[PDB]
């Protein structure tokens, strides 16, 4: 905004540098250290924090999605980046990040490394609470999702009021 308050286009000069070195470049005098950005969110986690990592991850995913003009609602990407950065560290979408969670063994074995997860569960005497959807599906029960996220009682009072 200008003096009158109207938004106007302004042209400034910035630098685009190949290679990653965050802290040293931020410490360089004459550089706006409050706005320096990196495309490697691992470096952002190492330097800035976890919330900045979430912001940078969302920015990268949005750039990848919207480079070709496609539009995806903000809530889906927000949920993805919240899941990825919910334990204080980056959780990769693979067997090295998903299977390391404290979820049930039945739902973890269904993704990858079924026999290894089952053997580890047998050796560690793990207990499955059957609160997820995968182990409810494999056991042929009503999963606690959608219409199964509650129970239907009988209205004795209204029937008596007849």
């Amino acid at each position: 905004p200008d003096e009158s308050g109207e938004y106007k286009n302004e042209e400034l000069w910035a630098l685009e540098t190949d290679g990653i070195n965050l802290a040293e470049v931020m410490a360089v005098p004459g550089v706006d250290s409050s706005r320096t950005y990196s495309n490697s969110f691992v470096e952002i986690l190492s330097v800035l924090g976890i919330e900045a990592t979430r912001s940078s991850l969302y920015k990268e995913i949005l750039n990848v999605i919207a480079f070709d003009g496609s539009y995806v609602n903000y809530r889906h990407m927000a949920l993805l980046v919240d899941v990825m950065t919910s334990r204080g560290y980056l959780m990769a979408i693979t067997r090295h990040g998903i299977n390391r969670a404290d979820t049930g063994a039945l739902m973890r074995c269904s993704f990858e490394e079924t026999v290894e997860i089952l053997f580890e569960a047998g050796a560690a005497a793990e207990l499955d609470d059957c609160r997820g959807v995968s182990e409810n599906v494999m056991l042929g029960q009503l999963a606690p999702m959608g219409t199964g996220a509650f129970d239907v009682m009988i209205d004795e009072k209204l029937l008596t009021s007849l």
Partner: protein, 84 residues
């Protein structure tokens, strides 16, 4: 212990789509199993239509037990949940 008092209920007073579908299916099955009908039947023969008519007049005798993540539950009557 796990029950929540009627004056302390914090869930929404509206009927969700999943709750509506579950109540409609249960009422249709019960009507098909020779259950008493709380509304008049003029020309409709489909139990689903009878269940929908009962839901519109708020006469379905069922209670929704909404489960909080901790384990506590709230009981909402079908006659007090707002239906769009």
């Amino acid at each position: 212990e796990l029950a929540i008092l009627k004056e302390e209920r914090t869930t929404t007073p509206y009927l969700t789509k999943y709750e509506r579908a579950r109540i409609l299916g249960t009422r249709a099955l019960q009507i098909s199993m020779n259950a008493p009908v709380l509304v008049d039947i003029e020309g409709e023969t489909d139990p689903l239509q009878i269940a929908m008519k009962e839901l519109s007049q708020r006469k379905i005798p069922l209670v929704i037990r909404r489960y909080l993540p901790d384990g506590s539950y709230e009981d909402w009557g079908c006659d007090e949940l707002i239906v769009d």
